[PDB]
Design a protein around this ligand. Structure first.
Ligand SMILES: [Mg+2]
Ligand SMILES: [Mg+2]
Ligand SMILES: [Mg+2]
Ligand SMILES: [Mg+2]
Lengths: 245, 245, 245, 245
């Protein structure tokens, strides 16, 4: 497949360039980083584009790709209901163009999240623990928050976690994301890790995702690049491409 | 829902009897043990039956229930392809009767199994650890083997687990269920536990299911009883009833 | 060894009574509850006494036992520096009497605590996770706090846990017991569990203690009773009796 | 302290050179790799030497260092009872020379091992799980074997692990090192990891050591280099220097 990479000197693109170069089945058709015109993509017959450039510029890129029937695997964040609306809009005019926007390309992470979603309604209790290196700026992770919201949403209409706590120390019970405790561990030696715990009297289920490399998103981006074709128009999140729905 | 229970003096039966009683939305309509004549089920307008009676007599029961339009949640094992085929047959005459047969009713167990199946093809490595009380007769557990099978099958066409082992001790690498290492830990204090691990360079995912009670199957049986009507004819395994969209 | 038991109608007492009975190398020589006169202990030539009676009456008992040369395994809490000091005093008059007072008799718990103390100064990061049934009143557990204290103290003079958190949610980082994060998980299905984690760039060490029974203190009490003679005067905490060379 | 490093182009030495160079309190006095005369050590007033050169040459080195009153932190393996005897011998003539020989310099590992040693006699069951990357040649690890031996030795005179297994699959119960099951997991994404499990009815204790870098031995070697002075003559294993005994 003829793959083009944007913001290709930026850490992700650069990595993706390497991934695509190394990869058997795909040929790298264009490597554009900032200061490069977008006409180069069509000039080399780019079918798919990987995009992870800054949020300010993504909208301007997506429009171009859509205009030109260029499939887009997008990893850039900063997307809003209103920005999805917008993309959803451009795609109306080009029904054969696929676009995938995903907050997270680590297959382990995405699976881990989807499993929590599916499990959450079958247990009395659910909590999230997340553990990261002590250089991380924010607590909980983006990923732990989004996870907790999903669980909360999946449990829309069950009782809240039982909990008889009556004296405590501030923070002893973690954060409270949509009614479900997120704990954040920061510990030397760690990279990125998350543990979703469910329990009910008699049994517990625990899902853990550990990520040891900056680079674990690669297999996912590649997956998306190899499959984006199968699903016309806008797809949000990688999970549909994992053929789980 | 008006529920009848067979094998009511065996361990599982006696349990569900308490269970059906305690449950508010359901009433118990007949409780028989081996040898109480089946007729009593219709005598009480039993809609669903829970069956956990011995393998020998299960086929005999299933016939009656299907004959009489009585839905059946069946937990007995010893089911074979040709036995399923048989059941499959009786059901053709009554398209309004639902029957559910499952190897396993612990919701946690069924979920952990399903997640493994769904995850299996996105990682280079997959192993199963099962941990049990030191009084268990067989290694690996029924559940561990079934699980390894599923993973093996979902990996039909990927390379086998990478493994450079060239010198070892017998058993150091555990069992080999269809190309997949299964390790059995036997340890005082434990009940029934299972941990599936998958790995790929840069990321790991682990699913653990812990069962602390004999009675963790109850929620599942109940769920099945509450839902069995939604699916006409034979269903195998609880996971379809865990309504997974 | 000829063993007497106080507070024999409370939960802990009644247990040790069964325990002393079952035990072959030991016989039970008196079992009193609040208000049975102490004299009965000597009336039966009781060598050691297990005490778990309420805090109010413990000092009253200890006096009698020490007066009479009767070794005491004491599990009651509510002990203060000045109460230890008092005990310490009574013992000066009888140098042949041994007394043991411990916050905690679960051998696993005491070991996990000790290991933490010994490990604490060789790592940059240290946190405590405790997980409990959702009916527990207080967060963190008594045991989690004691533990954090110990680690804090053993780290007297190292830098504090590294942590670049600058934006968070209240409680995301758990409690702060003496500079050490303690997180409390409350989850259906669980009993009493605790996981200490230490980390340093390149390596992590984790100690977990799981307690599945009300009755896990029994082996320790018994051990204490069997060993209390080996150490004259007051001993605090079971770990010295775990004979650590 | 005036530190000399041997085999200093070899992966360990090289690393140690860097560590010593970077390290505040120590000055690097000599960097000798193969082809360099040993007189250079004394020529620069080397107090301590780090040695990890090949086993064939170690004996020849140790003799020199001992002769010259040069302290030696040795990481080279291939040591035998008879080779310790030998070193023990050279040291007779120089009572002020310290020598430390250790199979393992990762403080986490050493702690993890020492804890298992101390715990092993207080539980009915003990097993070892070790997990490594799928490029590892041998199963179980050096470290898992040595660990199991220690446990076995510490349990010299208790009943063997209870275990009612009567049908199994070859390897389902792992290896059998001195009566205690070692399981080896090999999984993509992993580096070096070990989990010691103990259990007894009512409670379990679990010790886990994860190692994420080749380089986690550095802090230990440094520790030894900063402390070797405190203990005259031969010390085997790092654990005594961790002030645990
Ligand atoms: Mg290529
Ligand atoms: Mg009822
Ligand atoms: Mg007795
Ligand atoms: Mg220096």
């Amino acid at each position: 497949a003829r793959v083009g990479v944007l913001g290709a000197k930026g850490k992700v693109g650069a990595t993706m360039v390497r991934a695509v170069a190394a990869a058997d089945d795909l040929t790298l058709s264009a490597e554009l980083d900032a200061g490069d015109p977008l006409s180069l993509l069509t000039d080399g017959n780019t079918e798919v584009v990987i995009d992870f450039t800054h949020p300010d510029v993504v909208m301007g890129n997506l429009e171009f790709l859509i205009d030109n029937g260029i499939h887009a695997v997008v990893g850039t964040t900063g997307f809003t209901a209103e920005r999805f609306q917008q993309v959803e809009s451009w795609l109306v005019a080009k029904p054969n163009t696929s676009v995938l926007i995903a907050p997270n390309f680590a297959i382990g992470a995405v699976l881990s999240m989807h499993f929590a979603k599916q499990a959450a309604r079958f247990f009395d209790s659910a909590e999230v623990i997340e553990l990261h290196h002590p250089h991380k700026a924010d607590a909980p992770s983006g990923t732990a928050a989004r996870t907790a919201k999903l669980i909360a949403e999946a449990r829309k209409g069950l009782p809240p976690n039982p909990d008889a706590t009556s004296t405590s120390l501030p923070g002893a019970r973690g954060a409270d994301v949509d009614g479900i405790p997120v704990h954040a561990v920061r510990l030397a030696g760690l990279v990125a890790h998350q543990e979703v715990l469910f329990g009910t009297e008699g049994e517990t289920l625990t899902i853990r995702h550990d990520s040891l490399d900056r680079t674990s998103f690669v297999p996912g981006v590649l997956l998306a690049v190899r499959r984006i074709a199968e699903r016309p128009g806008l797809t949000v999140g990688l999970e549909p491409l994992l053929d789980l729905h």
